Amino acid sequence: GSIKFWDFQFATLNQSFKAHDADVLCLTTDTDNNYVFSAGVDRKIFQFSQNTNKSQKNNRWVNSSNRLLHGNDIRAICAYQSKGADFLVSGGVEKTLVINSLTSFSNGNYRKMPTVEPYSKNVLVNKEQ
Amino acid sequence: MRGSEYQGDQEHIIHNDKVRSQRRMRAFERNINQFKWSEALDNAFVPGMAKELTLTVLQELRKRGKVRVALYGRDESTLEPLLNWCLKGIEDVRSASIVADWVAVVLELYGNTLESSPVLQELMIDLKTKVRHEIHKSKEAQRIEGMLQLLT
Amino acid sequence: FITSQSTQLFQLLSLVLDSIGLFSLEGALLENLTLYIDKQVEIAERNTELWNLIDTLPTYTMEYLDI
Amino acid sequence: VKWCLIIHGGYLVSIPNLMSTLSSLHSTLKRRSDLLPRLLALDARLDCTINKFKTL
Amino acid sequence: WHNVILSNISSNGKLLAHMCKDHKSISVVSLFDDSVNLSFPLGSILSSQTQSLSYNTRYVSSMAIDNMGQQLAVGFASGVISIVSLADLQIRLLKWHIDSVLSLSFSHDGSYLLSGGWEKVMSLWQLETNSQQFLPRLNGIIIDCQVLGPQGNYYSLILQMTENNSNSDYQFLLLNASDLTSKLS
Amino acid sequence: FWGATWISRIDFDVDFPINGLTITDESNFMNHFFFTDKYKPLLFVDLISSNELAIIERNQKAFIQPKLVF
Amino acid sequence: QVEIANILSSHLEANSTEILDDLMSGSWTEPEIKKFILTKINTVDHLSKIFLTISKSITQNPWNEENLLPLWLKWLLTLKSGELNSIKDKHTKKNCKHLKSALRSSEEILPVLLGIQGRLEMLRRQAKLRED
Amino acid sequence: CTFYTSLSNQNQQNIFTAGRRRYMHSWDLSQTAKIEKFSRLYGHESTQRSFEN
RNA sequence: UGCGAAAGCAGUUGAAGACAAGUGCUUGUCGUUCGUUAUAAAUGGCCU
């Protein structure tokens, strides 16, 4: 359940957070690496932030916030940024997507997509018989 | 390693801070202390659990004010052990008041579930029989008690 | 008069019964009492449960739309 | 107990002390008799639910 | 300043952070210099979820200001603690207290946050890793906490003993930080 | 018409009264009335006959995170 | 039985004062009373009126030997508790308070009579032994 | 074991001692001895199960 | 809330101002006042 930040040039630990109560199955990052989002079996999403000016000089990450959005494990998570779009898409054993906003993660609104959205129908009905 | 035997008989100052080892605490106590209300109830009804110890973990939860809280996430599969003990606890004088308390709550909290589950319905008929039998015994005791007052 | 706030009056009768003692009481009168007190107990029990009572998806189903 | 009290009623009356020599009876009987109002309250609730689902 | 609802002074005694109804707005001012002068409405710090929920979430019951003026802790009756980085008004939530938090105090350096509430448990929040250490089963609820010493040798606490509803029965504790044991009760 | 969680009916002989989590779409994609939300989620909706409407509806252990209740 | 139910059904609509007489009719039996309450009492007003009449009748004399009224009360509370408490009338609550007073005066009796009942039981056996 | 004298307040003298145990002792500097026990690691008890070094 | 036994016996829960939300109207709120004896719900549980 630990998220650890290693320095690449020296291959040594810089910070250790005991965040989750179970595995951390996925990670994702913002374009500028101002946010690191984790998720796993504990059904939570944790945000880690370095966006503060004093932090960036000190490159210390801060366990900013966490949320409970999923009914079961979170296996896959991904993040996209653009001048018009800011998505944090997550999904897992619950078989559904959850869409959040990276920049406003702690306070922003979230949408829970339908489990089945029949664009391609799997059922037909015959009027006769 | 030759120093462990020494008890400091020749030393100026003797300083002891070790806290005495306390008896290991049972599982149900661990759950109350960690605020595991529901589990503390389950540990109450396990095979080979001394009757006196079980009566406590019912009393502690009532004293803590956690009776409904311990009975929320339950169905007929996991409610049966509580009733089975209650089926036996109702007889003894000591636990009669406590079982009277818990039995009332589960009815107030699982009236609807009771209708659709046939097993629970039998548990209540059998319970209804024995609580009735207890009334008769208590009523007899009163008549004896009145009988004695006449003699004295 | 009994057999023909009632709390203390009954409790007073219990005092009468004890003072009379074992020897003095008479069987014929006793049975009339024995019947009366049983009626009261049956009533006395009866009010009690009254008092306590006062203190106390389908796979396929048919439905018509509202249009 | 009922028969002992009945037959030897006269002798028991003429005893210097009864509470000391029959303390255990009073202790036992008092414990049961105290439970009666609580049990009746339990009985009434059970009849309420038992009547309910039996009708349903 | 007008219509001040709540106020606090840094551990050094050089910064004053207070809330005024000009709903409410928090301003921090340096006392012996004009170096620090910041203000912002409470709306910015408050999340939107707490805006949806009841009033207990938007109601502050304790406040604290870091010595350097970089961090400010706000308590809420809901039991949440919100640390605000003054430089850019960024929020960080620390949520352990089930009931209202009554005492907040930063340490001298700023790395540790002493918190106390109705739980009768003192919590030292380690802000580097957001961990915590506890001093539980105190004699009463902690009205106040502080770090009293050049090197944080002693923690000074005020306890209430809310059991006695007739009177307010305060008890002052001074704990040794080395082993968290009552140096003076 | 019907979607994942809504069913509707539009009568094409009548004109109507005039009276965040997606791309803002500043870029180009390339280069009489009835509405209900009671039934959901829907797999497929169709009529059996002139007055029978067929609505088809959908009917695992997870890590325990308790909800405190006092 | 059927005639009384329809007769009772009519008076409850008519707000007649003879509701107590219809309820007290000896033709009533326990399964019928359950049937009547389930099948005919479909509106809160009828539930209230019957409860009012029964509640007042019992409170005025909780010691009547005639078990038909209490038998009515027991089944009304047993079956329609959810609908009864839904009634928010102040007057309805006040009647319950009086009724709770009248009944509870009994339950304090019971330990006394059972005490009396024991003594008579001893006394009866005393006479039997002497006779033999 | 080792003596310790604070680099600023020269009057401060203290003795730190440790063993194959989970607590460290500190003796500030004669009827009695002022000895303090360090036995809290603040969330890192896993990494440290003995102070002996 | 008053009296009293613990049981109960009587009696209450009013008015103004302001803000927020939806659409001048509706509802909810009060670190605002006057007067009368007068559900909860930020995933949030206690050291060595």
From Swiss-Prot, chain D:
Compartments (UniProt record): Nucleus, Nucleolus
Annotated S-S bridges: none
Function: Involved in nucleolar processing of pre-18S ribosomal RNA. Required for optimal pre-ribosomal RNA transcription by RNA polymerase I together with a subset of U3 proteins required for transcription (t-UTPs).
Family classification: Belongs to the UTP5 family.
Miscellaneous notes: Present with 33100 molecules/cell in log phase SD medium.
Subunit comment: Interacts with snoRNA U3. Interacts with MPP10. Component of the ribosomal small subunit (SSU) processome composed of at least 40 protein subunits and snoRNA U3. In the absence of snoRNA3, forms a complex with other t-UTPs. This complex can associate with pre-18S ribosomal RNAs.
Protein name as catalogued: U3 small nucleolar RNA-associated protein 5
Residues of the full protein shown: 502 to 557 of 643
From Swiss-Prot, chain E:
Protein name: NET1-associated nuclear protein 1
Additional facts recorded: Present with 6560 molecules/cell in log phase SD medium.
UniProt signal peptide: none
Record's subcellular location: Nucleus, Nucleolus
Entire-sequence positions represented here: 193 to 384 of 896
Subunit structure: Interacts with snoRNA U3. Interacts with MPP10. Component of the ribosomal small subunit (SSU) processome composed of at least 40 protein subunits and snoRNA U3. In the absence of snoRNA3, forms a complex with other t-UTPs. This complex can associate with pre-18S ribosomal RNAs.
Entry function: Involved in nucleolar processing of pre-18S ribosomal RNA. Required for optimal pre-ribosomal RNA transcription by RNA polymerase I together with a subset of U3 proteins required for transcription (t-UTPs).
Native organism taxonomy: Eukaryota, Fungi, Dikarya, Ascomycota, Saccharomycotina
WD repeat windows: 96-135
From Swiss-Prot, chain F:
Regions annotated as coiled coil: none
Other information: Present with 5440 molecules/cell in log phase SD medium.
Functional description taken from the UniProt entry: Involved in nucleolar processing of pre-18S ribosomal RNA. Required for optimal pre-ribosomal RNA transcription by RNA polymerase I together with a subset of U3 proteins required for transcription (t-UTPs).
Lineage: Eukaryota, Fungi, Dikarya, Ascomycota, Saccharomycotina
Quaternary structure, from the entry: Interacts with snoRNA U3. Interacts with MPP10. Component of the ribosomal small subunit (SSU) processome composed of at least 40 protein subunits and snoRNA U3. In the absence of snoRNA3, forms a complex with other t-UTPs. This complex can associate with pre-18S ribosomal RNAs.
Compartment annotation: Nucleus, Nucleolus
Species the sequence originates in: Saccharomyces cerevisiae (strain ATCC 204508 / S288c)
Name the record gives this protein: U3 small nucleolar RNA-associated protein 4
Curated annotation (Swiss-Prot), chain H:
WD-type repeats, residues: 1-30
Signal peptide start and end residues: none
Compartment(s) where it occurs, according to its Swiss-Prot or TrEMBL record: Nucleus, Nucleolus
Origin: domain of life: Eukaryota
Membrane spanning residue stretches: none
Function in brief: Involved in nucleolar processing of pre-18S ribosomal RNA and ribosome assembly.
Subunit-structure text: Interacts with snoRNA U3. Interacts with MPP10, UTP21 and UTP25. Component of the ribosomal small subunit (SSU) processome composed of at least 40 protein subunits and snoRNA U3.
Family affiliation: Belongs to the WD repeat UTP18 family.
Remarks, miscellaneous: Present with 9570 molecules/cell in log phase SD medium.
Protein name (Swiss-Prot/TrEMBL): U3 small nucleolar RNA-associated protein 18
